[PDB]
Paper text:
A crystal structure of the [name] armadillo repeat domain suggests strong conservation of the NLS-binding sites between [name] and four other Arabidopsis importin-αs. We attempted to crystallize ΔIBBMOS6 in complex with either HaRxL106 or an HaRxL106 peptide containing the NLS, but we did not obtain protein crystals of sufficient quality for structure determination. Like other importin-α proteins from yeast, mammals and rice, ΔIBBMOS6 forms 10 armadillo repeats with strong conservation of residues that contribute to the major and minor NLS-binding sites (Marfori et al., 2011). We superposed the ΔIBBMOS6 structure onto the structure of rice importin-α1a in complex with a SV40NLS (Chang et al., 2012). This revealed that essentially all amino acids of rice importin-α1a, that make direct contact to the SV40NLS at the major and minor NLS-binding sites, are conserved in [name]. We determined the conservation of the NLS-binding sites of importin-αs expressed in rosette leaves by homology modelling based on the ΔIBBMOS6 structure. We found that residues contributing to the [name] NLS-binding site are strongly conserved in importin-α1, -α2, -α4 and -α6 whilst these residues are less conserved in importin-α9. However, when only the H3 helices of ARM repeats 1–8 that contribute the NLS-binding sites are considered, the sequence identity is approximately 45% (Wirthmueller et al., 2013). This conservation of the H3 helices allowed us to build homology models for the armadillo repeat domains of other Arabidopsis importin-αs based on the ΔIBBMOS6 structure. Superposition of individual models with the ΔIBBMOS6 structure revealed an almost complete conservation of the major and minor NLS-binding sites in five out of six importin-αs expressed in rosette leaves (importin-α1, -α2, -α3, -α4 and -α6). Our observation that HaRxL106 binds equally well to importin-α1, -α2, -α4 and [name] in plant cell extracts is in agreement with a conserved NLS-binding site on these importin-αs.
Author numbering: 78 to 85, 91 to 359, 364 to 402, 405 to 452, 456 to 498
The structure:
């Protein structure tokens, strides 16, 4: 409005500058760059002797880091990021926490910013920061900044984030919901797309704790923990087995059985489908009833995942007979009229696998029971209608099912 930048005690000015930037609506950031006093403020970061000015300066730049990637990039070009790194070793507790904050804002903005922060080796001082003497405010701030250090896609070089795993393992032991949430998010990022990464996460010994978090009374914690476990099962079988051996399935059942948040149910189904690829384990837990219940009653985003869970099991003989005895056919049949072609093909794949086992056990004088059951559930009509379908791939899949099991 009518500011005088008397920064050239000027702390008084730096405080106003900082407070102006921390305005909620229309923060006047770009006009601070017009005046061009950012390098002067960057010099104040290097004033260990006068930590109030240092604190108000760091805060003022943390605020500029918030928002858009530019004007975020001007803080990078000013050379403030390296200064924030060595501020993590300052004697002032308020400066250290502020330095942690600033680096979180920056790293979180983009993978380019993240990698830049990691290239300067911000990890090492950020970890030498968690201990018994660490307060709640610092504990929360640091775990969150760490969350952003691992966040983003493309992901950061695994081996840069790898030493976080030892610390993360301890952070999940906490009972603070803000710390637990971000820790699980951090872990969920470190398990995405690479069996090598998934293995490292298991070796840290976080799996048993994450199971307990599946029974947590707060979706903030429940979701990222459930996501991490979902990522662990997407890897190979020996990795998937480690979650099974930790009795994760009773916890997953609860999420389907009890009426949790719509999005949590669908994450649980997604996780179950990545197991069915060790199918024996899921059957013993009694998941199929609730999974069939979901496949009929629950809304489409969850049905889609349930369908995947069923089909993948039928891909991986005696087991299928139990699934049919749970009344899974009718559920699968009525989804053949679905608008989504991906789930229609998934259901065809499922019924085909069932019909194969139907023919198999028939040859042991009777008919194919499952083909009869499909016909009994109005399923044969729906399959015959797929011959008039737009998608050629579905016509083809529909025809080959008829020619093999109905002539």
């Amino acid at each position: 409005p009518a500011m005088v930048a008397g920064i050239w005690s000027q702390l008084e000015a730096t405080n106003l500058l900082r407070k102006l930037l921390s305005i909620e609506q229309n923060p006047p950031i770009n006009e601070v760059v017009q005046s061009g006093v950012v390098p002067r403020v960057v010099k104040f970061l290097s004033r260990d002797d006068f930590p109030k000015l240092q604190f108000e300066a760091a805060w003022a730049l943390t605020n500029i880091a918030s928002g858009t990637s530019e004007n975020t990039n001007v803080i990078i070009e000013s050379g403030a990021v390296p200064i924030f790194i060595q501020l993590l070793s300052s004697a002032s507790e308020d400066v250290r926490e502020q330095a942690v904050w600033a680096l979180g804002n920056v790293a979180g903005d983009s993978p380019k910013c993240r990698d830049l922060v990691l290239s300067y080796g911000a990890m090492t001082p950020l970890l030498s920061q968690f201990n018994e003497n660490t307060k709640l405010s610092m504990l929360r701030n640091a775990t969150w900044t760490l969350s952003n250090f691992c966040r983003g896609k493309p992901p950061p070089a695994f081996e840069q984030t790898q030493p976080a795993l030892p610390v993360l393992e301890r952070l999940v032991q906490s009972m603070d919901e803000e710390v637990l949430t971000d820790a699980c998010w951090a872990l969920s990022y470190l398990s995405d797309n690479s069996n090598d990464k998934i293995q490292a996460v298991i070796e840290a010994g976080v799996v048993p704790r994450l199971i307990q978090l599946l029974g947590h009374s707060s979706p903030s914690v429940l979701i990222p923990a459930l996501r991490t476990i979902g990522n662990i099962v997407t890897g190979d079988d020996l990795q998937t087995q480690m979650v099974l051996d930790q009795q994760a399935l009773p916890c997953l059942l609860n999420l389907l059985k009890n009426n949790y948040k719509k999005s949590i149910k669908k994450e649980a189904c997604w996780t179950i489908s990545n197991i069915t690829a060790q199918i024996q384990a899921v059957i013993d837990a009694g998941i199929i009833q609730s999974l069939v219940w979901v496949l009929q009653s629950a809304e489409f985003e969850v049905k889609k995942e349930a369908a995947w869970g069923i089909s993948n099991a039928t891909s991986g003989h005696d087991q299928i007979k139990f699934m049919v005895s749970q009344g899974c056919i009718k559920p699968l049949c009525d989804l053949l009229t679905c608008p989504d072609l991906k789930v229609v093909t998934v259901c065809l794949e499922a019924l085909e696998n069932i019909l194969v086992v139907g023919e198999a056990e028939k040859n042991l004088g009777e008919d194919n029971l499952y083909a009869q059951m499909i016909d009994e559930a109005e399923g044969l009509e729906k399959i015959e209608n797929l011959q008039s379908h737009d998608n050629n791939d579905i016509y083809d899949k529909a025809v080959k099912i008829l020619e093999t099991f109905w002539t």
